[PDB]
Design an enzyme around this catalytic site. Sequence first.
Site, PDB file in Angstrom:
ATOM      1  N   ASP A 198      51.890  36.384  43.828  1.00 41.45           N
ATOM      2  CA  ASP A 198      51.136  37.402  44.536  1.00 41.45           C
ATOM      3  C   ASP A 198      51.925  38.667  44.778  1.00 41.45           C
ATOM      4  O   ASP A 198      53.128  38.632  45.076  1.00 41.45           O
ATOM      5  CB  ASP A 198      50.629  36.841  45.862  1.00 41.45           C
ATOM      6  CG  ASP A 198      49.465  35.900  45.660  1.00 41.45           C
ATOM      7  OD1 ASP A 198      48.461  36.397  45.091  1.00 41.45           O
ATOM      8  OD2 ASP A 198      49.565  34.686  46.018  1.00 41.45           O
ATOM      9  N   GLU A 211      36.741  33.198  45.790  1.00 39.32           N
ATOM     10  CA  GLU A 211      38.070  32.637  45.560  1.00 39.32           C
ATOM     11  C   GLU A 211      38.810  32.766  46.885  1.00 39.32           C
ATOM     12  O   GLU A 211      38.849  33.841  47.461  1.00 39.32           O
ATOM     13  CB  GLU A 211      38.812  33.331  44.419  1.00 39.32           C
ATOM     14  CG  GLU A 211      40.067  32.585  43.975  1.00 39.32           C
ATOM     15  CD  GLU A 211      40.965  33.355  43.006  1.00 39.32           C
ATOM     16  OE1 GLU A 211      41.030  34.598  43.108  1.00 39.32           O
ATOM     17  OE2 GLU A 211      41.649  32.706  42.161  1.00 39.32           O
ATOM     18  N   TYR A 262      40.225  31.870  33.929  1.00 44.64           N
ATOM     19  CA  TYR A 262      40.705  33.040  34.649  1.00 44.64           C
ATOM     20  C   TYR A 262      41.434  33.925  33.670  1.00 44.64           C
ATOM     21  O   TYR A 262      42.525  33.624  33.228  1.00 44.64           O
ATOM     22  CB  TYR A 262      41.615  32.650  35.813  1.00 44.64           C
ATOM     23  CG  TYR A 262      41.901  33.753  36.807  1.00 44.64           C
ATOM     24  CD1 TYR A 262      42.529  34.940  36.408  1.00 44.64           C
ATOM     25  CD2 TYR A 262      41.574  33.624  38.118  1.00 44.64           C
ATOM     26  CE1 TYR A 262      42.809  35.934  37.304  1.00 44.64           C
ATOM     27  CE2 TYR A 262      41.835  34.627  39.019  1.00 44.64           C
ATOM     28  CZ  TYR A 262      42.453  35.789  38.595  1.00 44.64           C
ATOM     29  OH  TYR A 262      42.714  36.798  39.474  1.00 44.64           O
TER      30      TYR A 262
HETATM   31  O1  LIG Z   1      42.923  35.860  41.905  1.00 46.97           O
HETATM   32  C1  LIG Z   1      44.062  36.205  42.201  1.00 46.97           C
HETATM   33  N1  LIG Z   1      44.288  37.317  42.894  1.00 46.97           N
HETATM   34  C2  LIG Z   1      43.209  38.207  43.272  1.00 46.97           C
HETATM   35  C3  LIG Z   1      42.798  39.084  42.093  1.00 46.97           C
HETATM   36  O2  LIG Z   1      43.881  39.951  41.732  1.00 46.97           O
HETATM   37  P1  LIG Z   1      44.067  41.395  42.453  1.00 46.97           P
HETATM   38  O3  LIG Z   1      42.657  41.914  42.600  1.00 46.97           O
HETATM   39  O4  LIG Z   1      44.927  42.183  41.490  1.00 46.97           O
HETATM   40  O5  LIG Z   1      44.764  41.101  43.760  1.00 46.97           O
HETATM   41  C4  LIG Z   1      45.240  35.404  41.709  1.00 46.97           C
HETATM   42  C5  LIG Z   1      45.052  34.471  40.701  1.00 46.97           C
HETATM   43  C6  LIG Z   1      46.113  33.734  40.216  1.00 46.97           C
HETATM   44  C7  LIG Z   1      47.385  33.928  40.745  1.00 46.97           C
HETATM   45  O6  LIG Z   1      48.470  33.216  40.301  1.00 46.97           O
HETATM   46  C8  LIG Z   1      48.643  32.855  38.936  1.00 46.97           C
HETATM   47  F1  LIG Z   1      48.280  33.867  38.146  1.00 46.97           F
HETATM   48  F2  LIG Z   1      49.909  32.551  38.736  1.00 46.97           F
HETATM   49  F3  LIG Z   1      47.913  31.780  38.682  1.00 46.97           F
HETATM   50  C9  LIG Z   1      47.582  34.855  41.756  1.00 46.97           C
HETATM   51  C10 LIG Z   1      46.514  35.597  42.228  1.00 46.97           C
END
Ligand SMILES: O=C(NCCOP(=O)(O)O)c1ccc(OC(F)(F)F)cc1
EC number: 4.2.1.20
Lengths: 257, 257, 396, 396
Positions: free
Chosen positions: B60, B49, B175
């Site tokens: 974030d 990703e 997700y």
């Molecule tokens: O994959 C993401 N981050 C990395 C995994 O999370 P972490 O390991 O806690 O940083 C991630 C996925 C979706 C996102 O935005 C939303 F939820 F709104 F769609 C923001 C970050």
Amino acid sequence: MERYENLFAQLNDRREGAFVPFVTLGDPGIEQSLKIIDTLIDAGADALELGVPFSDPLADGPTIQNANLRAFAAGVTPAQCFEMLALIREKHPTIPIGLLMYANLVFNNGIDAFYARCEQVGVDSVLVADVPVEESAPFRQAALRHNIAPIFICPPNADDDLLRQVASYGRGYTYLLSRSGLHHLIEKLKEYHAAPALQGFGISSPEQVSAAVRAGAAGAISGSAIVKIIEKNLASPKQMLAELRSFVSAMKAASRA
Amino acid sequence: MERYENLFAQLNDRREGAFVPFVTLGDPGIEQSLKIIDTLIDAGADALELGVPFSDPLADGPTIQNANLRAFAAGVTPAQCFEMLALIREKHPTIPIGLLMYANLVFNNGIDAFYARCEQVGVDSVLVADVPVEESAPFRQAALRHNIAPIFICPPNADDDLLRQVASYGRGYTYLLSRSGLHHLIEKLKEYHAAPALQGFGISSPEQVSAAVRAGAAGAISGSAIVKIIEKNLASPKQMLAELRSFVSAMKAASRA
Amino acid sequence: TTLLNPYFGEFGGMYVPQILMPALNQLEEAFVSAQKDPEFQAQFADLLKNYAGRPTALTKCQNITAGTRTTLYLKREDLLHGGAHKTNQVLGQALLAKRMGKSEIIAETGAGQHGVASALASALLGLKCRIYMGAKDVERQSPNVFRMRLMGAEVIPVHSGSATLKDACNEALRDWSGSYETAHYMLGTAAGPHPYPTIVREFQRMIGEETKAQILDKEGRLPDAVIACVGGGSNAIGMFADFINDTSVGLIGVEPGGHGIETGEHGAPLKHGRVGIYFGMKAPMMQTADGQIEESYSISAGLDFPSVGPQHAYLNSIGRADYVSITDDEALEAFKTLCRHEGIIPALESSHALAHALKMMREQPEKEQLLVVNLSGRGDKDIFTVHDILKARGEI
Amino acid sequence: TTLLNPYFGEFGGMYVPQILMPALNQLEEAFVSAQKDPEFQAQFADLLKNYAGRPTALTKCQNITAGTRTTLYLKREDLLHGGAHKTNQVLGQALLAKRMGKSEIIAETGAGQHGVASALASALLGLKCRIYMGAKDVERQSPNVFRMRLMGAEVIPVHSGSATLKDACNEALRDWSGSYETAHYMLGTAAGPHPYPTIVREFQRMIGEETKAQILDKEGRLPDAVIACVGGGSNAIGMFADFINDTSVGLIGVEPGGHGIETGEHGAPLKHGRVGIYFGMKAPMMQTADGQIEESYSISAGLDFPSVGPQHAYLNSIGRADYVSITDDEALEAFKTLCRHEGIIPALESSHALAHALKMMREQPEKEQLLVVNLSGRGDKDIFTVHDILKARGEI
Ligand SMILES: O=C(NCCOP(=O)(O)O)c1ccc(OC(F)(F)F)cc1
Ligand SMILES: O=C(NCCOP(=O)(O)O)c1ccc(OC(F)(F)F)cc1
Ligand SMILES: O=C(NCCOP(=O)(O)O)c1ccc(OC(F)(F)F)cc1
Ligand SMILES: O=C(NCCOP(=O)(O)O)c1ccc(OC(F)(F)F)cc1
Ligand SMILES: *Cc1c(COP(=O)(O)O)cnc(C)c1O
Ligand SMILES: *Cc1c(COP(=O)(O)O)cnc(C)c1O
Ligand code: NA
Ligand code: NA
């Protein structure tokens, strides 16, 4: 006493106007102020007008505002002013002495007591700058009970009622204002048997003294011009007195026939 | 292509979960980011990703906010990100590559054109962080026309309508959020024939990967934990890659039967 | 001779040099005429409504009084154009100046609020405004000085005397004595020589008139007490006037206690001074044993007049109104309390009034009482003063 | 699915992460319920009248228009409690938060005015208020920060990103996504995701409703145009809303032109930006060719939102409203002009609206026209800004 009546009769016998200097008591200090006043008299002052230092002199321009500040710098108080007045009268038994007061200093410990203290030290008149004829009753009454002449201002536009009031209520002399902040006024004052008129405000040269007497006034008062000489010579007291002597001699000479 | 379908079938044959790291493209610079990504793959990443730096990443936390800032410090632009993506795909022909985008960067020059560019460089999926299912139609349609899987978030409280929508609209994987800013969700997603679930948010240790797979998820995504290692080792690139290799190997091992 | 009585019992009068009497008599005549003139009244009412924002709200403060039997309302002069009650009377006085055919306004100011009010009225009504301000105040009140200048007023620093309010007052009067044919002296409180204490009361009386109607609407009865701060007396007499004949309604005026009455550093001449003659009137003042006029002290510059309006001295003497004092610290606590519990930032002046109401409540919390405080102004202007104190003494 | 349309033509929507949709849906439902509830309407009206001071005056400015055929009125939101129109809608939103059973408020602020408004509403209504403010703004707006703290709000500096308004907005939304069960997000303009553009318009619409009644009373007809500044869009849509169906009434919105549109240093996305998706909505914004969101610039911090409410973009697109811009210097000249000629110190934001009316008048001085400017706030807060510029360029 009748010191103003005696003066004016004597001057009239000599076909002469009065010249009357104003200074602030205790400016620029008590001892120099006593010397200044003796010099004014020796130089020919016919009478004195003497200010008691006051925190807020509304009726005064900058020159005399500053004279008051100088006296306050020297710690001068009304009690010290009355001590000075007693010494002055002790040295000079006939000269008319008038005070220029603000109302609070007269009212403070009682109006009667103020005029009683004036009489005791030998003051002849009091002009209270911020008491118009309309508010004057307790002042003029207390004055008269203690043989003090209450002095009133006759402004340049005085209507006929005011002329008659000033003529009735005043004694000693009528303080005839040269301006705000004339033969009509002078003749009407005489018609109403007013106290003799002394012209004051802006009198600073001999020709103004002669002119005032020619217009029918009994004399002229000069203040800021005298106090300017003090202000100018603070650093040389001796020259101060010489310049004062020279100024007063000239102004008094202009009043003589 | 069908890279996610192929991956998940292969992992299922091996009774194995997916481990999917997230990094920001161009953090902390283009060349080191390319090396970081090759190291993630060599160490056992099943898919990637990849974030395109964006001025205002609302979804974030601080770790990834800072990753974006580092990339902006290096001058990284979306065009440079697409150049990187083409090189990555050229080196690694089967690994599924998903982007994490914000809406403005997709909409900016036209939604279709964005998905067309994804297809051209060989991207497999796009998750647009700030497009909820309710606003998703033009995005998911453009995605599908260009053989890109549109990825949706299934939040921890998803009601039944949302589960059904996510199951219908998503492709590639679902997700599954660990939390806001569970076997019920996983089973319902399977009942509605959703894309396989990858659990993400807060995944930072091997036991969480094993737990996610045991709960019935097809794998786990880890981001902040990976990006922390970058942040910690900015001064030693070589140690950075060694620490990344060690972390990914451990997380991937936890996914194996 | 005058048309109206210049005295309230012993207190008041016209203690000015003779040369200024015609200006005062002219002004009295003009005022008596204007008060009988429905056109003047309508013009004034129109400016009050459509320019200044009257009527002002009457706001119930239920968070402040929680757990007590006090019901507290604030009369919202802080919502008036300019942010203080002073606007009401400057508009009336500007209209009087116009009625007399004058094109020029003279005003004095200490804290600058009256200066700003005089300047805005003059700008609106096409009058050429000059404002006297002690040089120490000019240096101390840069924001208000720049407001006055933005509004086209000439600000004249007074370097004479102690270069504060009383010196500005004296310089204004000197000017007027020469210029009264074409200039009106717009005095800033319900004090000074007649007819000003009467004019200023009448041009502030809508405060209490509205308060009466609003409280009758909201509670069906009159207040147990109306409470106002007292610097010179205008906001207080404006609140009080319509209630004087309602003998059940307490009239409470609050003078500044400064560091405490016992320290001598205060501004409470009415209860702690001595009658004198100054500022054109016979009234209680701060003075030496010898009769020299001394200064008030308060955290709030707007409460620094070292005397008080003569009608207050009179109402106190007959027992119709009661006067109390509030210290700097009590005022500060009331300021903080209003901000936190009602979301209203009160002027430090007004905070003295509020502090006394808070005491009435706190001292006897099961006493049933309906209180109105005159919130004479807003306190945006005081936030730096308040910040600097709180910082200096450790908190914040 | 929603109860109300989230779009105004192309513009608007709900572009938030999925996790925030339930908060938005909950708020929409609560709002639709409240709008049908006579008790809610009465409580809101009562606070507006008796706490905030509504109705606000409509002031005719005859000195400004002298020698022309323009008649100009100012709608006096500068007289509202807090000194700006923002107070109206925070009171409505605080009541909504209470209706939903919430005890906590989150707000963002840039210039600090929305922070202060959120803080005073929260103090009044017993809500625990936390305010996000970019650290650069905290440092830049000490007076407003101290007001917020005086009123019991927690002010949280945001050091992330560029530490200005957009970063505060993002931090507020992050917090809300975790706390929405007990906290309401009190957004400060008629922008952001649905339902905020609709809620904020409805809770500001009394501006135009009053203006209509007042102008009909005073002139017996509707205005030729109503003119308002546009930062995010709330004061303007509040003025406009009641007139949208009066097709003869011009609706003119004024964006900040900064140093000039041609300089790129401005805040006029509606006419000089490009549609994007940010701040939860599809709207014109200030952005790079690449799609990164950039900053507005204006002398007036209150006009720094780098986008605009979606209903304005829509009204422009159909030709119902017209949008123009005014530079820093034009705004400054209008500020000076009002102070001098009417005795009213306008907010620099509002001065943009006034400047455009002045141009309408000056460019065609024999054109008969009846104009209303929304005077969205008072300008006491701007006097140092104005002083420092005038000093720097020589004058004063
Ligand atoms: O994959 C993401 N981050 C990395 C995994 O999370 P972490 O390991 O806690 O940083 C991630 C996925 C979706 C996102 O935005 C939303 F939820 F709104 F769609 C923001 C970050
Ligand atoms: O005699 C006075 N000054 C000295 C003479 O005037 P000048 O020579 O111009 O200083 C003098 C007389 C009266 C006065 O107050 C008021 F007029 F109100 F009663 C003030 C000064
Ligand atoms: O207190 C006074 N003015 C208020 C100024 O208000 P601010 O600008 O708030 O200091 C004040 C001014 C003049 C006065 O009488 C006299 F003119 F004779 F001196 C009495 C009181
Ligand atoms: O402009 C905004 N707020 C005004 C703050 O006012 P002030 O305190 O005067 O800067 C503003 C805040 C939030 C927003 O949407 C979202 F939350 F999504 F970001 C859109 C505009
Ligand atoms: C000037 C002022 C006062 C004091 O003056 P008064 O004449 O005693 O009313 C009180 N409150 C405010 C807000 C002021 O500006
Ligand atoms: C905040 C503010 C504005 C700009 O906000 P809008 O939402 O565009 O109305 C305008 N005027 C004043 C006085 C403000 O405080
Ligand atoms: Na006083
Ligand atoms: Na904008």
